[PDB]
Each structure stands twice: as C-alpha cells, then as structure tokens.
Amino acid sequence: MNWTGLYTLLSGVNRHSTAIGRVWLSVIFIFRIMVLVVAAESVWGDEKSSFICNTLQPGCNSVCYDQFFPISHVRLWSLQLILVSTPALLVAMHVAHQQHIEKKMISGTLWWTYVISVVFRLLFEAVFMYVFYLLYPGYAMVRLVKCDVYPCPNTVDCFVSRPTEKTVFTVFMLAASGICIILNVAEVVYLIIRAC
C-alpha cells in the first residue's frame, strides 16, 4: 500500500474534482470512519445492557430504552456515512464503466453527474443532520430520564450509560458533519463559478 494508490482510490478516477473534494473531503471521511470505529464498540457497546430503571415492573427497561433511543447514535452515523458515500461510489463505478466501454471500442456528462452527486451528498448530509436534531434535540445527554411508557406504572427514573463520553463523541461527529457540509457547498460553488 502506497500513498499514490490510496489517494487514487479515495479520489476515484474522476478528473473534475478540485482539491476541496480530493484532499480535504477524503481526510474528513477517514476521520469520521476512524472515530466511528473507535467509538462504536466501546462507548455504545453496553448502551442497553447497562440501561436500568428504578422499578420492579418486568419489561420496563426495554420499553423505556426504545422510547428514549429509537435508533442509537452509532447506527445513525453509520447509515449517514453509507448514504453519503453512496454517490461517490456511483460516480466511481460510472467512470470505470465509461473507461471500460471506451476501451472495448463525455466530459460534459461526467461533469454533470459529478455535480449531481455532490448535490445529493450535501442533501443527504443535511437530511441526516435534521433527523438527528429531531430525534435528539441538543448535543448534551442527560444521566436521568423520566419514562412513563406502558407497562411502567406512573413515571420511573431510568439511567443512561456514559452520558458525558457520548456527548463528547456526538460533538465530534456533528462538527465533522458540519465541516463536510461546508466543504460540499464550497465545492459546488467553485465548480459553478469556474464553469462560468
């Protein structure tokens, strides 16, 4: 493994991306992948097993955990990464297909599809940011929550596992997503300006 191969793999074979989406976006993507890898198994490993409520009612822990955590942060970020990386994979596959068909026997089409893929990537980033805002208002996570879902009688106190570490990693991931959004907007603006 060399740098001239890793850089080519990350950037794809596309020849229209500038240094914003070729040197900086790949680094932020690697940063997000590494943070998700080092945080998924350890911090969020025992989010449900150590989630306890102050009650004797059977089945209250599971219903309260599902009520307060419809989908954990780790899985939300994994889905966000997959959806954000899908258009880049599509562009790389399209470039490879065009190269194959021209070998066995265009610039504007590649430029347009790259612009469309960057727009879709920005849209996915914004959609996942909005979903995270809807599900979990506020970056901070609290230690104690009040759960009144059936079958729990009245309201019970349930305790979250590692609120502070999860808050730190949430801040990191949200900052990375914001940087990605800014870089995508800058890339779109730069391409439009240079094309005109």
Ligand X SMILES: CCCCCCCC/C=C\CCCCCCCC(=O)O[C@@H](COC(=O)CCCCCCCCCCCCCCC)COP(=O)([O-])OCC[N+](C)(C)C
Residues that bind ligand X (CB under 6 A): 1-2, 33, 37
User: Of 18 and 54, which CB lies nearer to a copy of itself in the complex structure?
Assistant: 54
The answer to the question of residue 56 lying near a copy of itself (CB under 8 A) is yes
Residue 79: in which H helix or E strand, if any? helix 73-104
Helix intervals (H) in 107-162: 107-135
User: Of 35 and 185, which CB lies nearer to ligand X in the complex structure?
Assistant: 35
x/- site string to ligand CLR, residues 35 to 74, per CB under 6 A?
----------------------------------------
User: Of 59 and 178, which CB lies nearer to a copy of itself in the complex structure?
Assistant: 59
What SS3 string covers 35-81? HHHHHHCCCCCCCCCCCEECCCCCCHHHHHHHHHCCCCHHHHHHHHH
Q: 88 to 107, contacts with ligand CLR by CB under 6 A? A: 88-89
Least separation in angstroms between CB 60 and a copy of itself: 11
Identify the residue among 151, 164, 171, 189 touching a copy of itself (CB under 8 A). Answer: 151
Least separation in angstroms between CB 58 and a copy of itself: 5
User: Of 4 and 154, which CB lies nearer to ligand X in the complex structure?
Assistant: 4
Inter-residue contact 53 to 147 (CB < 8 Å): yes
- Amino acid at the residue 100: H
Alpha carbons 142 and 33: distance in angstroms, whole number: 26
User: Of 115 and 176, which CB lies nearer to ligand X in the complex structure?
Assistant: 176
| Structure token digits, residue 100 | 């194959």
173 CB burial (10 A radius; 0-12, 13-18, 19+): buried
